[PDB]
């Protein structure tokens, strides 16, 4: 349960770019604890986040965010001289805003949504190598009153992997029937995909939930998405369908056949998953 508070706090966080095993690179909030996808960044509309960023690698890296407000000096592009030299540090500043009525009378949308950050300088001047190595992460910006979940899982379709994992190796995620589960879904690389969840549908809008009986957003369980698209939704685990090993996968047929599959294990209260047998 819960709802998002009105935002406006100034926050600081340490971020590191680190080599990981397998030629992979990752972001982390703590030295030695980088992860792919990188750490989830949660902000409420109006918050400011000062990211004290350190590049612990032997090659330049950058941090570039979708959707938030930044001045060009926190762009994370080499083109604007906001990348980070090997061993260097720099403070990237992100700002967010509430919606509101402009003086001209139009409506200014807020920053709330499902967003992401990624490298922009490794391999190419668009971060093609660093994205491919794992330098991407989720950003959620909440509007005041937004329903909060019991858990949030990030699913990144990165070329032909999920979260840079080997073919047919999840990730799986667990919930109990009735848990309010939040999915952040991000795509990267060269390929278009279609993201599909067995047993669970969501609304194709900002929060993934219909606002009420007046909301005309299509209700879907299958969504085409391409490089750098990002969306999210919230579902009630097992709602209307019960416990089980509920597949999610890319529905591009060869993509699922070659490994782009994982499991949303929905448990009964006693912890069991009927008919689940790997």
């Amino acid at each position: 349960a819960g709802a998002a508070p009105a935002g406006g706090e100034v926050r600081r966080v340490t971020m590191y770019a680190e080599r990981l095993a397998g030629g992979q690179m990752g972001y982390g909030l703590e030295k030695g604890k980088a992860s792919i996808p990188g750490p989830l960044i949660e902000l409420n509309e109006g918050d400011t986040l000062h990211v004290e960023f350190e590049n612990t690698m032997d090659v330049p890296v950058s941090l570039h965010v979708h959707g938030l407000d930044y001045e060009i000096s926190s762009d994370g592009t080499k083109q604007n001289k906001s990348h980070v030299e090997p061993g260097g540090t720099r403070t990237y500043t992100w700002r967010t805003h509430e919606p509101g009525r402009r003086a001209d009378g139009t409506w200014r949308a807020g920053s709330a949504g499902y967003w992401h950050y990624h490298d922009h300088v490794v391999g190419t001047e668009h971060g093609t190598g660093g994205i491919r190595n794992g330098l991407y992460g989720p950003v959620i910006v909440r509007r005041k009153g937004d329903v909060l979940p019991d858990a949030t899982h990030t699913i990144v379709f990165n070329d032909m992997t999920i979260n840079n994992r080997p073919a047919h190796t999840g990730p799986n995620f667990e919930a109990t029937v009735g848990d309010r589960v939040e999915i952040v879904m991000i795509t990267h690389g060269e390929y278009y995909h279609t993201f599909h969840m067995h047993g669970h549908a969501w609304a194709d809008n900002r929060t993934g939930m219909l606002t009420g009986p007046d909301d005309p957003s299509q209700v879907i369980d299958n969504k085409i998405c391409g490089p750098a698209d990002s969306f999210g939704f919230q579902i009630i685990a097992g709602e209307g369908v019960g416990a089980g090993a509920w597949m999610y996968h890319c529905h591009v047929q060869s993509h699922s056949d070659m490994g782009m599959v994982g499991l949303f294990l929905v448990k009964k209260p006693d912890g069991t998953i009927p008919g689940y047998d790997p």
Copy 2:
């Protein structure tokens, strides 16, 4: 008219058969398998028990998008709810209306344009069965939804429409004024862009704006990928009159290679001008 509130327990029997030259299909009676398979329509609240029978020499399953089912009705080998050659099984699909949850949020109803397909032929994601023609449309209506005079199903399965040979349509006929409903499904390996000459729709659940407050983009072109489903209703010839109105994938090599047909909109006397 419009659609009623649902809550009926419906039954249907569905067969999977082989068809000419390696294709495979679903049907309501044997020897009558079609590609795409039979349209299933429900009202939110309805339950459907599909008495399924596999008539083929290989396993098959029935898996549906969007509807409520238990893990036992998955239609996946993974959960052992596939059907062995010659075997039978009853799949149960449920639907629900929208309403406020216990937690105060709004729960979406089942209404939408959906589809069902095989999941075990060729691969454990049904790649061979989908290619062969094992897919069909499902419509679930909300109470009050306007009913059409006709419903046509267009599936973009890899480089074909409805598994037909290149440059063979299908065409669909209507008369000016008809309320024409289109179920559009995509399957296989390619993205596509579905496009209709002369008619636009709203990019929302019904394909029609709710009213003057519906901000949905109005479009005549929509990108879709494998297992995307959507639908819409148009008044044929509205504002444009009768004639042979093209629809096609708008990916240029795709239309060029034959993903194209004609929506033949007839004058009340039955003649299509310029055709």
Copy 3:
């Protein structure tokens, strides 16, 4: 903020198809002034446009429009024998309508939206050769009260080009901070793309702007699109982010690396751009 009036005017223009340098083809409103993309046609909901069209080329060409009302006589296809022979002429007629309640109580959508026109006859019966050559252009149909921009810019992703240009030639677009800028984005050809704008987001709906605090459309800065997709939006240039050279690009990694990139040059009031090299 100035607004679109109600429509209902009958407008007339002349349009020519002409060969252009580099084995190209384009539309223009005056002989010898064709461009790629073709001239922007703007209509108010309910206006009619009669296009006095001439084919100055040695192959059949045509004019086909998305989104607008036309009879098969102006369909623009060899199917409905509405193409234009070499040297020939023809008058194409487009109509638009306002929205309203039908007899049966259902709501008829207006013509308002971001649309486009292209050839349908060169190369094949689907205009593949014409579209590749540059026979395409934008159409904006405005609804009464729609907010009017200070400038409109058309970005067409045509196969692996922007506006048929060579790789890494932009185009760039200039604005001043505070300007209300309108983007028209059209895709053509064989491939999918994902349009991305640095520092500026918009609403995934008809206008690119949220109606108010009840509009649930997702706010995005990244959007997958395929051949003959069209959408548009207005942004306040630099809002929340400030002046600077703001990148836009296809976010498919190999597409950006290979030059599907341009610049949204947002200038301070004095015309300078921080950190940019003119």
